Amino acid sequence: ALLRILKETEFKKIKVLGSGAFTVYKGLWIPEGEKVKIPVAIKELREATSPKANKEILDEAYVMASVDNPHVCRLLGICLTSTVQLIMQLMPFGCLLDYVREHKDNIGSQYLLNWCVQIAKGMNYLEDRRLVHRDLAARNVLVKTPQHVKITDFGLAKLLVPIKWMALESILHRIYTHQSDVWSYGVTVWELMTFGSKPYDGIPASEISSILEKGERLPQPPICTIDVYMIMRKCWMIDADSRPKFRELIIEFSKMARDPQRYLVIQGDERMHLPSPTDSNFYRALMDEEDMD
Numbered sequence: 444a445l446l447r448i449l450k451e452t453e454f455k456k457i458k459v460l461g462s463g464a465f466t467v468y469k470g471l472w473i474p475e476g477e478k479v480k481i482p483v484a485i486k487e488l489r490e491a492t493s494p495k496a497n498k499e500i501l502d503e504a505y506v507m508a509s510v511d512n513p514h515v516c517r518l519l520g521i522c523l524t525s526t527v528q529l530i531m532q533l534m535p536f537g538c539l540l541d542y543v544r545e546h547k548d549n550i551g552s553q554y555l556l557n558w559c560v561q562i563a564k565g566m567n568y569l570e571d572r573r574l575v576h577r578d579l580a581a582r583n584v585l586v587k588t589p590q591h592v593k594i595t596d597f598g599l600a601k602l603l604v605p606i607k608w609m610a611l612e613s614i615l616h617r618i619y620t621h622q623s624d625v626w627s628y629g630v631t632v633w634e635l636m637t638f639g640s641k642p643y644d645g646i647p648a649s650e651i652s653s654i655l656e657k658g659e660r661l662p663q664p665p666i667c668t669i670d671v672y673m674i675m676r677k678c679w680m681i682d683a684d685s686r687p688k689f690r691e692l693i694i695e696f697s698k699m700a701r702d703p704q705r706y707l708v709i710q711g712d713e714r715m716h717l718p719s720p721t722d723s724n725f726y727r728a729l730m731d732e733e734d735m736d
């Protein structure tokens with residue numbers, strides 16, 4: 444019941460928001476018998492085969508329609524035609540990568556650390572459900588409000604290549620576990636703490652696996668103390684079961700979000716605080732009524 448099969452005639456694509464490797468549209472759901480048009484997000488993929496890619500897509504979409512977590516985007520509906528179209532809640536703020544990139548001069552420690560906690564809470568839920576993201580990145584974290592981030596694009600990757608966000612065991616042997624997701628998680632934290640820098644900028648993807656084996660890792664971002672950089676460093680250990688668990692990651696960034704400036708050194712950090720409750724409640728009443736935003 445968590446996945447609504449839609450007819451083509453009851454939703455319309457309107458404007459393109461972006462496109463990657465799996466095209467995302469700002470669209471309009473028209474419920475039958477009504478005069479309202481309800482904004483939705485529509486992701487359309489490449490070609491598809493009826494004699495095959497139907498249940499394979501539909502059965503795995505039911506999995507994606509079952510994720511129930513404040514920090515993981517749920518698939519709401521599907522339309523199975525020549526193409527494949529997935530309908531989800533439109534998030535008007537866009538991805539966290541472009542967000543922190545357009546707001547470099549305005550992301551405090553309280554936000555950054557809280558975003559880590561939220562991403563780890565999302566990722567930790569997927570593990571409790573025995574599910575592997577396969578494509579975690581700052582571009583796959585959506586901004587519902589600036590105070591509430593949600594992971595997106597779960598289970599896309601498996602049903603359909605981001606070398607610079609994959610663990611070595613995944614580049615070399617195509618092994619994808621919850622511990623490989625932790626690697627990608629660590630890279631995402633690096634994108635966030637650099638305000639959106641490209642990982643291994645300029646280095647060809649072909650050569651990433653070698654530099655990992657000789658022990659290149661992403662550099663400690665300026666604003667990071669070694670406590671945070673150590674945590675990052677531990678995500679990219681060669682031995683996957685030496686990497687932190689998502690559940691450990693929640694507790695630690697939570698600890699650090701309780702004294703933000705001791706762990707991140709941002710200029711004027713004292714003036715870029717979280718919203719007052721008043722602002723927070725107004726935000727939620729219009730944009731984010733979710734049970735535990």
Ligand SMILES: Nc1ncnc2c1ncn2[C@@H]1O[C@H](COP(=O)(O)OP(=O)(O)NP(=O)(O)O)[C@@H](O)[C@H]1O
Nearest residue numbers: 460461462463464465467484532533534537538582
């Ligand atoms: N539900 C959504 N609401 C609003 N914007 C969205 C939504 N889903 C995706 N987008 C944006 O649409 C664009 C395309 O996303 P997508 O096609 O998944 O490529 P990508 O995230 O940039 N990289 P990848 O997912 O790894 O292939 C990105 O700029 C996303 O932030």
Ligand SMILES: [Mg+2]
Nearest residue numbers: 463582583596
């Ligand atoms: Mg995406």
